[PDB]
Amino acid sequence: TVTYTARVAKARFGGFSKLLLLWRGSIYKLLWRELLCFLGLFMALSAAYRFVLTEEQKRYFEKLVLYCDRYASLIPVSFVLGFYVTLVVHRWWNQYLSMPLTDALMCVVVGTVHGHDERGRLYRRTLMRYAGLSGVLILRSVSTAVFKRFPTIDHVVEAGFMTREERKKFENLNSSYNKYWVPCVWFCNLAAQARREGRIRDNGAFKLLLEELNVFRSKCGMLFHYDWISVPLVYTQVVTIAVYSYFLACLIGRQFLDPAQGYKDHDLDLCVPIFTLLQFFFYAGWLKVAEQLINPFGEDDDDFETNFLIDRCFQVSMLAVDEMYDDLAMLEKDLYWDAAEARAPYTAATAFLMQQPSFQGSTFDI
Amino acid sequence: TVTYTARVAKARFGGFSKLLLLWRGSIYKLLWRELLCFLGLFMALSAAYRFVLTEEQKRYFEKLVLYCDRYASLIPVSFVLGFYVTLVVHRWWNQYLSMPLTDALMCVVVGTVHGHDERGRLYRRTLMRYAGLSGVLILRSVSTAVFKRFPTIDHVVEAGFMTREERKKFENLNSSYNKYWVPCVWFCNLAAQARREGRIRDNGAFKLLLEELNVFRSKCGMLFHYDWISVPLVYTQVVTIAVYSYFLACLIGRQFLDPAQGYKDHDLDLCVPIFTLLQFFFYAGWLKVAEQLINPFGEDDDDFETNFLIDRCFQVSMLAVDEMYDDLAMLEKDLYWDAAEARAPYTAATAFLMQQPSFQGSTFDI
Amino acid sequence: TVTYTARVAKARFGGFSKLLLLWRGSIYKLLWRELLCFLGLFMALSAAYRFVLTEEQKRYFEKLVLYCDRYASLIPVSFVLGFYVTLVVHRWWNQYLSMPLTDALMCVVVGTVHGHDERGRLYRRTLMRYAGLSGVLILRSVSTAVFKRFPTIDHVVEAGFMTREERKKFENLNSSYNKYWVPCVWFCNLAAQARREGRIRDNGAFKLLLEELNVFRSKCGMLFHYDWISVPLVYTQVVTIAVYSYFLACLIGRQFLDPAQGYKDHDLDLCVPIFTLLQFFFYAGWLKVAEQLINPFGEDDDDFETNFLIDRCFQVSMLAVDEMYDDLAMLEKDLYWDAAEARAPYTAATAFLMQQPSFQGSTFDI
Amino acid sequence: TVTYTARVAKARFGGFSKLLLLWRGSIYKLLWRELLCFLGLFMALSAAYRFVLTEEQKRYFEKLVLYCDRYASLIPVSFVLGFYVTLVVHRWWNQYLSMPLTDALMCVVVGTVHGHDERGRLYRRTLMRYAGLSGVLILRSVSTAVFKRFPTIDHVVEAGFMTREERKKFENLNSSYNKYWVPCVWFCNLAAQARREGRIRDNGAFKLLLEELNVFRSKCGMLFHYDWISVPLVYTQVVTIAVYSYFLACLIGRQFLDPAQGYKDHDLDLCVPIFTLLQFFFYAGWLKVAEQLINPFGEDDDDFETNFLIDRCFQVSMLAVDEMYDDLAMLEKDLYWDAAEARAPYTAATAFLMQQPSFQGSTFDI
Amino acid sequence: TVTYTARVAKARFGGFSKLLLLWRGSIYKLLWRELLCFLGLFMALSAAYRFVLTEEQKRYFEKLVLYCDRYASLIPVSFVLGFYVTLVVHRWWNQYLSMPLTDALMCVVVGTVHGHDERGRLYRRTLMRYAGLSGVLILRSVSTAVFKRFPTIDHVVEAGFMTREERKKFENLNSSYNKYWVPCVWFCNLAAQARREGRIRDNGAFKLLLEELNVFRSKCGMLFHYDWISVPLVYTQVVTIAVYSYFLACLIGRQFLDPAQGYKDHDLDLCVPIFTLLQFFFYAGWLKVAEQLINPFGEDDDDFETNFLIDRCFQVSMLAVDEMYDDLAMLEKDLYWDAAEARAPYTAATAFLMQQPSFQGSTFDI
Ligand SMILES: [Ca+2]
Ligand SMILES: [Ca+2]
Ligand SMILES: [Ca+2]
Ligand SMILES: [Ca+2]
Ligand SMILES: [Ca+2]
Ligand SMILES: [Cl-]
């Protein structure tokens, strides 16, 4: 994921114009091979029109430039690009909200599954490893960067998510489908065993763990749904036709003709159609937005860092439920225990922009 | 469902242009009969204009080509296509999220309904079969591919979802409406019987089962709502008129006239209007997107695989609540039990793209 | 509601073109009186131009046809129609999801309110009648078809939703507002009485009934909100002006002039502007979409069948909580009790389209 | 709020054309002063062109009419109006769903807080008054019509929402911010006191009251968020510039020139540009839609009736939790106690439109 | 945040035209440097065309003005601006709803965590400080104005959110990632300690605190997701190219040529292209809307007041859970204890606009 949020914090003079010189995840990284092909077919059509095309067919070619330019319907391309791309960014953002994060589950495990002994932390470490295993098994199904890290189940056993004796349980289940759900059933069999032994003391404390797991698996179940049910291929191919057929009538219809032939609106030869290549940055570059986000789990520069989130949500959960269980600082009085205004002080930099009176509503004329 | 997600993982040079040669669920599979009819009425109008139409009516026909081309309002067709199709893909995706999946219910049944004996697994197998029966009864109402698998209720009894003695209970309920809800009431009468016998030990454990069933039936209730309440026929017929009346003024208005007659912008004869057929791929093909997703439960190639999800969610639930109930591997220490960094190792392929420092926020200039 | 979902299951050759011959809920049922008025003012303007208009004002009329056609801004009408109609279909679908359905409440009443005696079924029948009464009282406020069935409260008492002695309780509450909430307060006073008597055994079982009622009343409360807060009249009148003022400049600007006068683009007389009436099907018919869904509770053919849902959700709830309470078939083994694959068999028709290998993810190259 | 829902129940011949004669909340009530200014600057520019402008500058003025008409970009105004207004109607409807309604809380108070004595109804009346006070304190902050009813806190004490001794508690909290939250903390301190005294019998009954209050305050917290965080002023000023700069190039570019001067497309003098004023109804009237809904809590005719909802949700809650607590009619048998079909009868008017067979699904060919 | 809601309460004559003279957060504050550069390159191109450009290249320059004006595709810029900006305002508003507010948690802490002694208020003050610390640690990661207030963790310790002995616990956790979650795990370890000691009396009272914390942290977790996963840089650069390449063909294509040269539509010299600068307010100003909301946590005038919400939600929570715990006014009878109509009185200003009869539904013809 290309993060440029700190560059665009405040709207400056050169706000978005400094963004046109970046390379990682940019438009020029995706379109430098297509503009070489577009100039490769434009210069092959102009150098043949000046040199190869003879005079009887130079008149016929000029009858085709005025035919292709009038059919260059550049308006209706913007709606089959406009409505298709916002369908894509809607699915691209909903695929990130469906990423399996164990952060809502690591606060319930550390709050409900109790015990300071070896078995007490073994329950909290295995419950979070079962959540971490079920996120590895679904991300290695939908993302190429995780599958290159875990090509086999033995690469998951060697990584520490699965043990050697859980793989005998995992591989002896006669199921012809994907088995990312398996660790989520091991979560329920272990949370019901810890509830029976008294590790989970209350009854609502056990219900919250099974509530917060169905929020976590549905996230694993949605990633399998977005991977299987993509956008319709008939709807991807319409947008691909509409851009490339516009760029077929514009490859010929924007050819620079001979001025002395005597044709309307064709009186110059720029030697390079610079306001046509800038249409190729805008029309074809709008398609390359949706080419990058149609599968955000690949290995593009602006794709989702799925291997970052696996190592993060495996380390910060084992830190939270094993090393941070019931290890608190002792309770002392706050800095504003006797002050009726718990107002934190300011620095010198954020000091004179903070003199506005408090907004209390639109009707109170302050 | 046509899945092409692995082809479009990273944006390449020939990224979406390789998609224009696929056949299953494509645009050419849906439009090869219409372009034959469109060329069948274009070539019947051109071969009559050169040969059948005499000179007094060849002048009158040329007065009609310039009349139909100026009314070829290709711009306003893109908005009655643009706003109607995104209404359709919104309903097409919401009909997939309303698909009855028993995965959120198979984790509560294996966690709350207990017992290792024959009656203990008979409760878990009948509770999941009642969820699986209520998904069969609603999918055979809304989807053609399931109704060809279950034309009668006896085809559901022979398949194993309903027993022979439950059909006497199912068919003696004097109700003139659809009875997909029936197994969801059998779920509540069986979950309250297992709670009374002590199979469901806690009180919040019984409340979670009735909570997770109302999430499951509302999914069965939404599929009946999308099947009954389709998009308005007055709104389908406006889009169908607007495309086919544009293609009536474009069938005549884009005719290739005689150049020597002396008319503006009509100086050539391509013998095949290739930039008009490419408008037929884009305008009529945009309508065939919404023709395929207006009922996604049919038997198209890009329709929902409803019979896959019936056999999957009947097999993986009976595997989870009967064979996987309280059958865990024994608890042992993890690979990172003494390591303060639970960091899984990497392979050689995903090795040198993983050297970025960890993103901690936009304000920390790293 | 006009349901045509079975006709549009698979995209055929004549897929949407068979829809243009339907009559119920169609475009021709709504626009046959307006095209008679539109031709009534077009033919009154043409037959006066040939016969009534003399030569000094036939030149002045021709100066007005070329003035009205250049102001025929057919493009900006499509956006005040495009954005207004999708606001309308968004409210039209959200008014159907806010329809009071007692199906999520009939599963909690049959699962929590217990008792096989006369008082045990009287509690379940009165709790569901109080939900059914509160849906009648809100639908007779917002829908014309229910108010013609229940013009007075005595028509609700005679129908069986309210008793004769509940109407004395209903009509002696000194409230000047709508009283659809009243039965939802009778639900809470009866669910707390059954909980106190031991009919509702558990404490979470009583909390689920008050949870599922606030989901049900908010649905009754949303129908009162959509009925009171419609779309803004200033926003309805802008779209009505923009279509009818476009059809004023197009009623005169698309008049067929005399060819020998010598004017550009006016060289024919079709005797009937067929590509202008087809613009009246598309522009005015787009407005008649939003004319039908601005109040979907009327008595149009494509309006909501509110009287169907009253009789359905009153019959299937009394069937579920009175005749179906704790009346189950006895537990027996399933058809796949010893088989590790619970795979239901197929027919002969859905037999050879089911040979695809199971999709397990995009990265597994199968 | 202007409610016209009963007029638009069924799509008639004069369906939306009867709406163009209404006055309350209409387009003519908002635009009668602007069309007087628009004609005031059009007639001041035409009567100066015929009379004041001499012949050497009548030629220069005619060079400016053809310059302003070609820059009259009426297309791109419809998208900065189209996307801005649907952002506004999205916020205008979400501000109505965030209106603090005590109806979901009056059913939990009457169901959980018990007692028939004086203290038993004093708990239910004070808990609902604390919800009603917290809605008054947020609506008098965000709405002008409530602030004109409660300019001071003593106008709230005299109205009965706050007592004289609660104002000493309210005004001695040293907080410089808005204090609409205060009564919601008084709700929790009173619900925990009634739970301790045994007025709230169960433990889940107390959890539902604190659950349903956080749904109620977040509604009060969202109204403070929409009042403080409006739409961006840079995004309001772009739409205001784009309409008023289009109406500057159209004020001059649509001037009726002298026909004998010899200019293209300018051959008449209508003496009043009627298809330009109809563009002022459509373009400027689209802006006046968003001028009315940018703050829906003012005192327009189509604004939210906030003082209606204060008096309604203060009267129907005190009626529900004080006069309607545990005052039920006695349980008797329904009208369909022995009938297996609980089908309510029909009238004579809704009698022959009810003969359709019941829809059971798309696949059942009925 | 620039709040102007009180100015736009009612739609007046000069409603939005008074907004075009504001300066804070306006369009002129963001675009006064770009119109100086745009006039700086327009006047450098006109003063070179009159004076520097000689007659042989004054003819070649005039061949380029008519070439750049025909490629000035001002229509397709409005859709790559229209669909990109509403993606931005969707993320800008969802980043405000994901702001960590402790108001839903301060009502559960004051209602469940009990005790009037020193340890009883120390539990409520430390639980709310742990929520307030976790909002400081995520806002100093994503917002520049908070990071200038807390550049180090010692600036948070000196401010009072963290103690000196909690920083030893905070900095000895060997984690290479962001540690905003840490105080949310300290919340669970303290809420489970207070539940064990009997400070939290009930079991559902403890479950509500862990429920309302996962609502609060997911808000802290969403701010880290919006900061890391911005909009795609390929999609920001397409919109930046499309505006700046339109303003390259419009910088040259809208040049005022010499009238006597003899070119179509170029007959005047305004000496300042006022309807082109007004296109720069509309096209480039539409981009500066999305330049300000792409990171709403900076230090613009219309950015989010993040330091206001830190001091507010730290003061009003310590006021609610420490000074306002179980300190109620005594219960007395309301003003409408014997009146069956709890109708609050009106003033004189809001007196004669309140005579409408109560809306009870669309079907009741009142
Ligand atoms: Ca990708
Ligand atoms: Ca289909
Ligand atoms: Ca209707
Ligand atoms: Ca207003
Ligand atoms: Ca900013
Ligand atoms: Cl609960």
Query: Which are the contacts of E14, defined by CB distance < 8 A and separation ≥ 6?
Result: none
Amino acid at E58: K
CB atoms within 10 A of CB A75: 16
Q: Which residues of D touch A360 (CB under 8 A)?
A: 141, 177-178
List of chains touching E (3+ CB pairs within 8 A): A, B, C, D
Distance E296 CA to ligand 5 centre (A): 4
E290 HSE (CA, 13 A, CB side): 25
* Domain map (residue ranges) of chain C: 25-96+234-293, 117-228
Q: How far apart are the C-alpha atoms of D284 and D288, rounded to whole Å?
A: 6
In 3D, which of A272, A287, A254, D81 has the Cα closest to residue E73?
A254
Tell me how far CA of residue E245 lies from CA of A17, A39, C53, C240, in angstroms: 12, 19, 53, 38
Token output for C37 = 């008025």
Backbone φ, ψ for residue E174 (5° rounding): -75, 85
Q: Which candidate, A208, D148, A32, places its Cα nearest to that of E205?
A: A208
D8 interaction partners in chain C (CB closer than 8 Å)? 291, 294-295
Would you list the DSSP string of A118-153? HHHHHHHHHHHHHHHHHHHHHHHHH-HHHHTT-SSS
Map chain D to HEC letters. CCCCHHHHCCCCCCCCCCHHHCCCCCCHHHHHHHHHHHHHHHHHHHHHHHHHCCHHHHHHHHHHHHHHHHCCCCCCHHHHHHHHHHHHHHHHHHHHHCCCCCHHHHHHHHHHECCCCHHHHHHHHHHHHHHHHHHHHHHHHHCHHHHCCCCCCHHHHHHCCCCHHHHHHHHCCCCCCCCCCHHHHHHHHHHHHHHHHCCECCCHHHHHHHHHHHHHHHHHHHHHHHHHCCCCHHHHHHHHHHHHHHHHHHHHHCCCCCHHHCCCCCCCCCCCCHHHHHHHHHHHHHHHHHHHCCCCCCCCCCCCCHHHHHHHHHHHHHHHHHHCCCCCCCCCCCCCCCCCCCCCCCCCCCCCCCCCCCCCCCCCCC
Alpha carbons D180 and D136: distance in angstroms, whole number? 8
Long-range contacts of A336-343 (CB under 8 A, 24+ apart): A336/E160, A336/E318, A337/E125, A340/D174, A340/E319, A340/E323, A341/D174, A341/D176, A341/E315, A342/E160, A342/E314, A342/E315, A342/E318, A342/E319, A343/E311, A343/E314, A343/E315
Q: What is the CA radius of gyration of chain B?
A: 30
Phi, psi of A210 (to 5 degrees): -75, -20
Distance from CA of B350 to the nearest CA of C (A): 15
| Sequence-separated (6 or more) residues with CB below 8 Å from residue D1 | C228, C229, D302, D303, D304, D305
CB atoms within 10 A of CB E64: 15
| Inter-chain CB proximity E174 and B358 less than 8 Å | no
Contact in structure between A246 and A283 (CB atoms under 8 Å): yes
Cβ-Cβ contacts under 8 Å for B325 (sequence gap 6 or more):
A189, B110, B116, B121, B124
Ligand showing the shortest atom-to-Cα distance for residue E301? 5
Q: How far apart are CA B231 and CA D233, in angstroms?
A: 37
**Who among B129, B294, B308 is closest to C8 (CB)?**
B294
Q: Do residues C274 and C39 make contact, with C-beta atoms less than 8 angstroms apart?
A: no
Distance of alpha carbon D314 from alpha carbon D322, whole angstroms: 12
CB contact under 8 A, B329 and A163: yes
Does the beta carbon of D224 lie under 8 angstroms from any beta carbon of chain A? yes
Nearest to C144 by CA among D354, D356, E364, D1: E364
Residue whose C-alpha is closest to residue B305's, from A229, E154, D350: A229
Phi, psi angle pair for E200, to nearest 5° = -95, 110
Tokens of D312: 């309604």
Instruction: Report chain E residues whose CB lies below 8 A from the CB of A214.
Output: none
Q: At C240, which helix (H) or strand (E)? A: helix C233-253
DSSP 8-state code for residue A321:
I
CA distance A304 to A293: 10
Rounded CA gap, C245 and C251, in Å?
10
Question: Which chains lie within 8 Å of chain B at 3 or more CB pairs, if any?
Answer: A, C, D, E
Ligand nearest to the CA of C203: 6
- Give the C-alpha separation, B123 to B129, whole Å: 10
Question: Within an 8 Å CB–CB cutoff, is residue E177 touching chain B?
Answer: yes
Q: Ligand 3 being an ion, which residues bring their Cβ within 5 A of it?
A: C 295, 298, 300, 303
Continuous H helices in C293-333: 306-318
CB A356 within 8 A of CB E181: no
- Give the mutation candidate from B238, B291, B297, B304 for the C interface (greatest C CB count, under 10 A): B238
Structure tokens at E86: 């509403």
Residues with CB under 5 A from ligand 1 (ion): A 295, 298, 300, 303
Q: Answer whether D24 touches E (CB < 8 Å).
A: no
Query: Which sign does the torsion angle of CA B272, B275, B280, B285 carry?
Result: positive
> What distance in angstroms lies between residue A39's CA and the mean position of ligand 3's atoms?
56
Write out residues 194-223 of C within 8 Å (CB-CB) of E. Answer: none
CA Rg, chain A, in Å? Answer: 30
Residues 6+ apart with CB under 8 A from B115: B121, B123, B199
Asked if residues A138 and A224 have their Cβ atoms less than 8 Å apart, the reply is: yes
**Angle between helix A55-70 and A233-253 (nearest 10):** 130
Whether residue A361 and residue D177 make contact (CB cut-off 8 A), yes or no, is: no
Residue B9 labeled ligand binder: yes
Question: C321-339 in b/e burial notation, b at 16+ Cβ within 10 A?
Answer: bbebbbebbeeeebbbeee
Would you tell me how many other CB atoms lie within 10 Å of the CB of residue B70?
Answer: 13
For residue E308, the tally of other CB atoms under 10 A from its CB is 17
**Residues with Cβ within 8 Å of residue A47, at least 6 apart in sequence:** none
Q: How far apart are CA E251 and CA E35, in angstroms?
A: 12
Using an 8 Å CB-CB cutoff, list chain B residues near D363: 140-144, 146-147
Residue of E nearest to A333 (CA): E122
What is the C-alpha to C-alpha distance for residues A267 and A340, in angstroms, rounded to an integer?
79
Whether A21 has its CB under 8 Å from any CB of chain E: the answer is no
For testing contact with chain D, the best of C123, C235, C305, C347 (most D CBs within 10 A)? C235
Work out the number of other CB atoms within 10 angstroms of the CB of residue B82. 21
Who's near B119: CB < 8 A, 6+ residues apart?
C331
Looking at all shown ligands, the one closest to residue C30's CA atom is 3
Q: What residues in C contact B87, CB-CB < 8 Å?
A: 86, 89
| Resolution for this experimental structure (Å) | 3.0
Residue C34 φ/ψ, nearest 5 degrees:
-85, -35
B336–chain A Cβ distance below 8 A for any pair: yes
Q: Is C263:C58 a contact under the CB 8 Å cutoff?
A: no
Residue whose pair of structure tokens reads 């309350």 in the numeric block: D24
Contacts of D82 in chain C (CB under 8 A): 79-80, 82-83
User: Which is nearest to D162 in space by CA: D122, D188, D131?
Assistant: D131
Residue of B nearest to C84 (CA): B83
Q: Is A285:A27 a contact under the CB 8 Å cutoff?
A: yes
Whether the CB of C355 is below 8 Å from some CB of chain A: the reply is no
Annotated binding site of A for Ca(2+): 9, 292, 295, 300, 303
* D91 in C contact zone (CB under 8 Å): no
Q: Which residue pairs, CB below 8 angstroms and at least 24 apart, start in A268-272?
A: A268/E60, A268/E63, A268/E64, A268/E67, A270/E67
- What burial letters (b/e) apply to C261-290, b meaning 16+ CB within 10 Å? eeeeebbeeeeebebbbbbbbbbbbbbbbb
Contact D237, E4 (CB under 8 A): no
And the tokens for A48?
Answer: 């043949």
Q: Is D362 touching B (CB cutoff 8 A)?
A: yes
DSSP bridge pairs for B113: B200
Q: Which ligand is nearest to the CA of D301?
A: 4
Q: Within B143-265, where are the H helices?
A: 144-147, 154-159, 164-171, 182-197, 204-228, 233-253
